[PDB]
Design a protein around this ligand. Sequence first.
Ligand code: SF4
Ligand code: SF4
Lengths: 440, 440, 425, 425
Amino acid sequence: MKLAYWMYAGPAHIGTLRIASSFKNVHGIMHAPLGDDYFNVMRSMLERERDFTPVTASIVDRHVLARGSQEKVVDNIIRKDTEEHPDLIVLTPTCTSSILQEDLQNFVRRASLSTTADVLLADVNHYRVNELQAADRTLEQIVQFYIDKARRQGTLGTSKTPTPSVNIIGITTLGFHNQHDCRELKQLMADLGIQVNLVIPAAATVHDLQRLPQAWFNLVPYREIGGLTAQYLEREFGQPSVRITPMGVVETARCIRAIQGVLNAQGAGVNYEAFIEQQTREVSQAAWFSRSIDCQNLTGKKAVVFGDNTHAAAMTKILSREMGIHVVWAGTYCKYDADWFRAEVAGFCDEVLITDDHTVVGDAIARVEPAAIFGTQMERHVGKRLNIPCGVIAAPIHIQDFPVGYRPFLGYEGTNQLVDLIYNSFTLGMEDHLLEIFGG
Amino acid sequence: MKLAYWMYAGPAHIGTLRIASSFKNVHGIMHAPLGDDYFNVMRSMLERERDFTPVTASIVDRHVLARGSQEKVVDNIIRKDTEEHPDLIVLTPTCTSSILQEDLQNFVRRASLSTTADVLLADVNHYRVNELQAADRTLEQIVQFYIDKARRQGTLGTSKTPTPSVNIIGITTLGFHNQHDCRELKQLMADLGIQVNLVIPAAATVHDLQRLPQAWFNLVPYREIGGLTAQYLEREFGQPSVRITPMGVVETARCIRAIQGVLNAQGAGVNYEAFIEQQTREVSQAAWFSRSIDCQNLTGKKAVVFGDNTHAAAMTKILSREMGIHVVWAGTYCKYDADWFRAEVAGFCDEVLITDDHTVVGDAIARVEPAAIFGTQMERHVGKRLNIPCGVIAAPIHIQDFPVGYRPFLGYEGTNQLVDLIYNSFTLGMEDHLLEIFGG
Amino acid sequence: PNALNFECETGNYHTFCPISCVAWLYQKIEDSFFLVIGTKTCGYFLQNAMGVMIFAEPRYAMAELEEGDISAQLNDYEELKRLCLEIKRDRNPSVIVWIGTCTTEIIKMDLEGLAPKLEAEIGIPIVVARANGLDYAFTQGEDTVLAAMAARCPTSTQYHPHPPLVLFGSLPDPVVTQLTLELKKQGIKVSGWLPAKRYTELPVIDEGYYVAGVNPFLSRTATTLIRRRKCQLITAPFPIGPDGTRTWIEQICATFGIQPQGLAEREAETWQKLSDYLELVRGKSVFFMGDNLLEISLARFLIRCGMRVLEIGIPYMDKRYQAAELALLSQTCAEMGHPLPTIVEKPDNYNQLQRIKALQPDLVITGMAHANPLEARGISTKWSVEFTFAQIHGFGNARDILELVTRPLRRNQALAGLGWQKLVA
Amino acid sequence: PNALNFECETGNYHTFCPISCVAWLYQKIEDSFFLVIGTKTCGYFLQNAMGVMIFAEPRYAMAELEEGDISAQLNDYEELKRLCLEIKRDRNPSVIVWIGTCTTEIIKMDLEGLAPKLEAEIGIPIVVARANGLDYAFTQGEDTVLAAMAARCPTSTQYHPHPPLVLFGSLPDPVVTQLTLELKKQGIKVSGWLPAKRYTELPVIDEGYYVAGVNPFLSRTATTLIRRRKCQLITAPFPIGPDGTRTWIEQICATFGIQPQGLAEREAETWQKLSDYLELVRGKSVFFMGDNLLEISLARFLIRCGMRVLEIGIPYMDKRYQAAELALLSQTCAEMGHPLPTIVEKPDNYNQLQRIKALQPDLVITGMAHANPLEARGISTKWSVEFTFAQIHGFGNARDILELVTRPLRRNQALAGLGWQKLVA
Ligand code: SF4
Ligand code: SF4
């Protein structure tokens, strides 16, 4: 039993819902008491969604404890089948589903006999995985399943496209600046001369999945979602993957070099090197920022960074390697993937913080007194209490963290956004200190 | 004699320099004492310029009062001619140049005999015009001059392009979000199927100017700079103009309808109406924002707006007509163009404020106690003193108001940016009031 | 001469888990501490539902259960001790309230049993409220907390004679002051209120006292006062709206044998000051998807305001407790020549969206799950939760109710003559 | 045995108008008010140059002249009266300082004449400082204000015997305390400082006192103290750097016939604490484009630090006033076996950019006009103005100077192994 009121990563079921909500005509149904449907409130508010969130609750009320929770589940699956006609329905275990231990696998077996829709049970367990791991697994599960259908039906499109092409894997609903990252990524592919074969979860149809092996390779932009799927396609198809998050100038260049190797390895005959020079000098302003007097004034200034694996590791390397900032500590709440984090940031901060207790993060901000904080909404609120600016880089995010203005974090324009975000947090706190120093 | 320490619009010479600095190979030289060259500091800091600012000072020291200020001016013109080889050099009167009353027109006449560069004297007078009017006039002056050269040399390209095309006139250095507005405008033209003939001041060469009459028409995005030039081309060439600032959803649609009329009037055979529907529903999120519960929570909330003519008038109509906000007063510091302002905002605010005294603006903010302020850096600082959020919409701007992230105010993406800017200012002040109400 | 019609659907609808009551109750009971024994599912809900208040160092925390707690590998009593002690150290509360949760039910954790023991060992009162999604909706949470509080109320040990009246229902202090001082004009004393500002201020409640409900969802609390405390319940319509407020007072005075002096005028004056909202509200239709139990009494108010109510959705309906409020609704339907609406208990949101689609109401009252999807479809919506935290009780707050109900109507006016109302994906 | 070389160019260079001295002087003289009589050109400069301080309700304003003022259609004395009165109403200052401007010169406005008259009528001291771009550069502004102040200083009416010493030059209070308490260790009393915290605290200065400069640009103020006040000027190097600070003290003590007790050690200790900045600074080249008159003494410091100075650009050089500082430079060049650098007065920035291009120095010290264009060309730069407002005087501040000079050197280290240093358009 632990006492807490803040959590950085939600219950497992949130990840499965985010996966289900990112495809079209996929309906999640949650085996859960009345009230666990707040996911729909969140989706509709934060993403300002014009469409109903395709997530329903097979309710668990007391009449469930009595062999309940296993007859409405079949009824609710079929009713959802007929009313909404989805391609796929995904039965969704919660914390409650977890301690009643009913043969959910069975209802799915049964229900799929009476429904036009395919049916799955999210292979996910409240007490073993969080939102992110759940989402990673669910996405693999659905890809594998439909890869399997293609095979057994003879429709598995197995020949690589004539010209190099890619699958972009891991773009998700309620994912931090995902919609913009996605647009930034398709644009980069287009500039590189690479057809985009398929983008998955987000806006994909389940019927597209069989076209996946037709890509020459797979790009996975975020550490936490899509790894599983990229790996399965490697072992089944020999489909290589590039998992370097193009976030920042130096990392964007890596990603693109890796793509270069992987394609030339299959005969592409391509050099991107002139493209990288031309984008780095002309399209990104970040290289130029690093040389400018603005950035020079930041050298040696102290920052702390906290977030998920992808954004905190990328932010940490942008601060140190690209702007001469002194990152006193960088941390992540992805404990289950802590070793990856420590390795990514080695040599880019003085100390590494691995925790998911906000009060440990808070105390570690007060003790260090940085000039700026890059973290979640909770680190933003610590900044306000302590009079220190904060740039928000990772989820638990609020509505202001879902802009309709174009704000990717990835790619070359993403580098432009990170400069502003960083220079603005430092300069707001300096300008404040000066005001007080002068008058008020 | 007036007592003041803040001004919204700078001395006349600033406008001429901004014009000279926006073309390539145009060198401004200012007849001025040591120290009036702060324009270069400003250019280099705010725009983080990689190139030296092509503006030099023909110095006025005491040895000037003694028939000085009229021999170095010739020497300095020719020396600049030979060292930098500009296409055009522009002699630049200041407040000092104004009260020594020397035959500057003569030196220009003389100097242009010894220089490969063309030479002009900015037809601008410290005591009669401000930065903006000066820039408007200077831009007309240079267009006319080079139109004239083309004519007398027989090179005036006078036949309209085969397919409709446009001149975009008024994009300027140190212009509020101009570089991004420019990119947003070329993209819109491209989507409309309109070739872009020429973009002037910004990045244009003086030798291009003669191609101007080849455009079917001219688009002037900002009220304050380019009107003069658009009008001259109308009377000399019969070249129509569209002067509707596409800033906001309703105004963007107007601009595009006007373009529609002007082109069909010369035989284009084009209907944009499906383009406007498709952009308004799919690319802009602003229409959807207006219907959403987020915007519903703003109905009737009080705002004040203050800035230049273009942005304050466009902001005022976005707040009232597109979001149901209660704009208690809207104002501008462009006194010399006040009537245009009053007409643009009639029926969109309760009261109109015309002033260029920041303390009148400040007192008018305290008395009204709006929930948010849209104004200049000085209105932002009043907001801080009064604990009221402020979105910055117009010059006197700081470095944080020159982002490298893509932030147009115009066009369809510009509508996306204005939503965030507005929703964020309102929500920051609500969230603050709630914090205090709950604890701290 | 033909009465209200009551229906009952599948119970498949959106509403806030009753544990949300911690958010306003910790705010209300100043020295309390709310410990919710639950999972990350519960924590995620509260962290998100209480928005900005989660950054105000709330007097609330989850006791988050591990796999070891579910299998009893960890001793529940010992677990609760270690952390209820942490609470006493860092906050020095005057009561700790345990919120029983779905998980605690399913694994049968004897909170009601462990509490009196742990209380003794530790020095602090522990109040158990089994407020879970298995059993209850949204504002019903407060009812389960206040019922439990009623057991803790101390005993015995210019106005008119009348016996002690004690009112129950958590309200913002400004609205207590206003209501208390509303009865003071009729010569009625408010001996106390069930929840007071501090747990240490709970009112005396002796056998023979009168009690009255101020909110429609306080059934259990009322049942408790009658049966366990031995009180007389004045059943009355709830003082929401100026019609509500006057009826509420008239009925209190009537129980005590008092002629309500000078309030026909006090009502008209309130109605008159609402001319401008009534012009907007007149003739338009409303659809209450149910979610917070205020719905019978808001519908009743809005019918007197001149609206057509097409459906009254409700989580749960206590015909005994609401009785007078239900009598005022039907009578209101007769006086305004409005056909008796149907009350849908335990509604089916899915079905309800089909009915809304068929009816095209002018106003759907509803949750944030359906609002943006509706707006995008051209149906105007008002988010229902705001009704639970805005001040809506008494004469001075009838304006507030209407500001709420007309808000989407006003945004419609301000944005008229711009063809994009129905713009879906 | 062959000395420093002095050159003089066109005077075509960037620097801050001397009216900028209002920004730090109003900050320094707490009860003063600086009225700058000028145009929008001047206003625009100050509004922009003083950055954030323009939002701190500064005790500064432009008296902005209209076309009616230029033609004498408006009476200048009457104009100054109406608004100097506004100032007295809203700020109740103890001195108003008029900053004469280019415009006031060219139209010949007798400020020096109008001031004593207006003063009498209004009750407040008016100090005229003709600090314009026609005549002076940047920090020379303070020299013209302090010369004018010197005339206002009152007259007469454990330490060693020595006659009254009064130091001149505006510095931040912390640096006064530090310097005053540096002489206190040598048994030297600081009878006062020319500018004190309040105009009302200006020191006594009687015929026979000693004075010493703390900043290199205080010529006029020094000339004034000698000639108009009848003081003895201790010419000495300026206490910038620990070499500067010790020489400054040694020379004061020497004037008074005192053996400086215990400071060879105080110097070494300061140098030792700079090991890490000296490792970076050693062997690298510097180029001072001139702009603030600190340059002779910074160059001299940086040569002792082990750097090669390739050019010392300077707005204006007073060989009489700097004398000792110039003697310390040449001697420093000899002790470090550094060839005597050339001092370029009134430099030509254009030409200077050609020389920089030819020399590729490791560090260009320079204005914000040239910094970003240089960086983009791969030349490292340090913006010169920061030297005027950072604390750089005395032993405790030699670190600060180096933090400044090494800053671009440190950013170079942190960003090494990323091929984009030379990236122009
Ligand atoms: S319904 Fe039960 S499980 Fe869900 S949040 Fe509420 S208490 Fe927790
Ligand atoms: S140089 Fe003269 S004109 Fe220019 S700002 Fe300075 S005082 Fe004014």
